[PDB]
């Protein structure tokens, strides 16, 4: 038995179209902008820049360790060892995917502190740009507004070159000095 | 277009470091009140040690636009809403020193100087520089410390095989 | 030695009024600087001029009720010159040698009570020597089963 979603659509006999997934912002049916949470409320897609993601997972495993000990009653290279220890505590251990993920995240995160990831998240989610771009803008370090618009091609006409270049400056300024 | 682009270029930069020193102090302040238990002498040094670090970056952030900001020197004009309730404006726009300025005098008078002027003063500067040069002597002695560097007996199964069959 | 250095690193004390008043000192004298770092958060509202400025502004509940973007400046790059070039500024750099001197005087004082603080630790060096002079059962108590209190020693029947 495998996992299901909040997307209920009834594909009766009519198999296909399964139209390709590209950054023409045409992601899956599953990674659509209009999502639905377990409380039925229509809620927007949640995309994470690897740092926003690093923090989320760390937070979740930290809180899990709490309940695991409760139910039992009756510097980056330094973060890697610290995280690899938390994984030994909460995770199934067979889950090697999370181990690599956490290592990659620790080594590639642009913003260390939660405070930092807070401003990143503000500055960006005010552009009206779709969660995918807003994440790739947070996770890909670009200098020219062309570097950005080339790598994130979906952006193309969505933002001024200057407006994007102004953002790229105040993004570089937020980067935690590793 | 009516009114003006006044100042505040690096003002955002001051605010950020102004906040982090506020944020680290505030949190220590909140705990400081649960004197019921002090957080672990590790914990307080983690918060009060990066809380002091926060003010180094906030200390320096002030000098970096340090030409720019004392030059900007803005005094407030606003909505007259600011004029009612008064003081808040006196308070919020005021620079001073506290009871602080006083141990600043205790310190200033603790030095060996005060009213003797320019020629004797320039000389003291050269002398303090000589003290810093005698401090280089630390470089020489550090070289001496000279500490820098870089970081079956057999087959179990077969034994048993023998015991059972005489296969050797 | 380590245990005793760890003891001094446990904040630990049994003081009445002595211990009491001291911690109240921390509360108020720390709180002051906490509160004055809040004037620092008020310079934040002082920006105004931008939406991200409003965000910083709401930092005061009184900013929540003092709507205006209020303040404005001009140019005295000349006054920056005066700050830097004044004979007063040369002199003020003397206030730098002066406070720094008294800081070095403090430093000297702290440093000396440190070697005498290591001297109470020589009482312990002696205790370890006493133990060196003169069962390796390893136990843990105060329950929990992990961490808590853990130590080792012998016993009799066998």
């Amino acid at each position: 038995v495998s996992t299901s979603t909040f997307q209920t659509r009834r594909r009766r006999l009519k198999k296909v179209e399964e139209e390709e997934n590209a950054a023409t912002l045409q992601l899956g049916q599953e990674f659509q902008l209009k999502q639905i949470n377990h409380q039925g409320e229509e809620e927007e897609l949640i995309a994470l820049n690897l740092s926003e993601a690093r923090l989320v997972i760390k937070e979740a495993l930290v809180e899990r360790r709490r309940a695991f000990k409760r139910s039992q009653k009756k510097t980056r290279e330094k973060e890697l060892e610290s995280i690899d220890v938390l994984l030994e505590q909460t995770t199934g251990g067979n889950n090697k995917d999370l181990k690599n993920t956490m290592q990659y995240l620790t080594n590639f995160s642009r913003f260390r502190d939660q405070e930092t990831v807070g401003a990143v998240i503000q500055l960006l989610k005010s552009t009206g740009l779709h969660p995918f771009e807003v994440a790739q803008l947070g996770s890909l370090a670009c200098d020219t507004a062309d570097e950005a618009k080339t790598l994130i091609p979906s952006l193309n006409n969505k933002i001024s070159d200057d407006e994007l270049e102004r953002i790229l400056k105040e993004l570089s300024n937020l980067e935690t000095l590793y | 277009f009516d009114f003006n682009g006044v100042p505040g270029q690096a003002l955002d930069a001051v605010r950020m470091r102004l906040a982090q020193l506020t944020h680290s102090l505030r949190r220590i302040r909140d705990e400081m009140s649960k004197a019921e238990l002090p957080q672990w002498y590790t914990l307080q040094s983690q918060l009060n040690v990066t809380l002091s670090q926060l003010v180094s970056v906030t200390s320096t952030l002030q000098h970096f636009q340090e030409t720019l900001d004392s030059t900007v020197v803005y005094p407030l004009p606003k909505f007259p809403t600011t004029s009612h309730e008064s003081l808040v404006t006196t308070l919020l726009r005021k620079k001073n020193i506290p009871e602080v300025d006083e141990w600043m005098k205790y310190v200033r008078e603790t030095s060996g100087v005060t009213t003797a002027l320019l020629k004797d003063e320039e000389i003291e500067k050269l002398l303090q520089q000589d003290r810093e040069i005698t401090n280089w002597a630390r470089t020489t002695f550090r070289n001496e410390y000279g500490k820098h560097d870089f970081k079956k007996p057999f087959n179990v199964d077969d034994v048993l095989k023998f015991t059972f069959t005489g296969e050797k | 030695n380590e245990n005793g250095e760890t003891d001094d690193n446990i904040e630990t004390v049994m003081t009445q009024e002595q211990f009491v008043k001291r911690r109240r000192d921390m509360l108020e004298h720390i709180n002051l600087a906490m509160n004055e770092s809040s004037l620092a958060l008020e310079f934040v509202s002082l920006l105004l001029s931008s939406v991200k400025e409003s965000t910083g502004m709401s930092s005061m509940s009184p900013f929540l009720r003092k709507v205006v973007k209020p303040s404005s400046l001009n140019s005295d790059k000349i006054p920056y010159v005066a700050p830097t070039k004044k004979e007063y500024i040369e002199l003020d750099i003397l206030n730098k040698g002066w406070k720094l001197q008294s800081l070095n005087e403090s430093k000297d004082l702290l440093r000396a009570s440190f070697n005498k603080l290591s001297s109470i630790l020589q009482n312990e060096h002696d205790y370890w020597n006493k133990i060196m002079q003169s069962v390796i059962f390893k136990i843990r108590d105060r329950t929990s089963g992990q961490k808590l209190l853990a130590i080792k020693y012998g016993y009799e029947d066998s």
């Binding site: - | 808040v88 005021k94 | 958060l41 910083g56 005061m60 009184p62």
Partner: peptide, 25 residues
């Protein structure tokens, strides 16, 4: 996103920042 909300404390009862000497005509 530094923390969440911004810590009030606003104060006019503090030590004092103003002096006084031009009161006389």
């Amino acid at each position: 996103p530094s923390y969440s909300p911004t810590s009030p404390s606003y104060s006019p009862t503090s030590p004092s920042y103003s002096p006084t000497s031009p009161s006389y005509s």
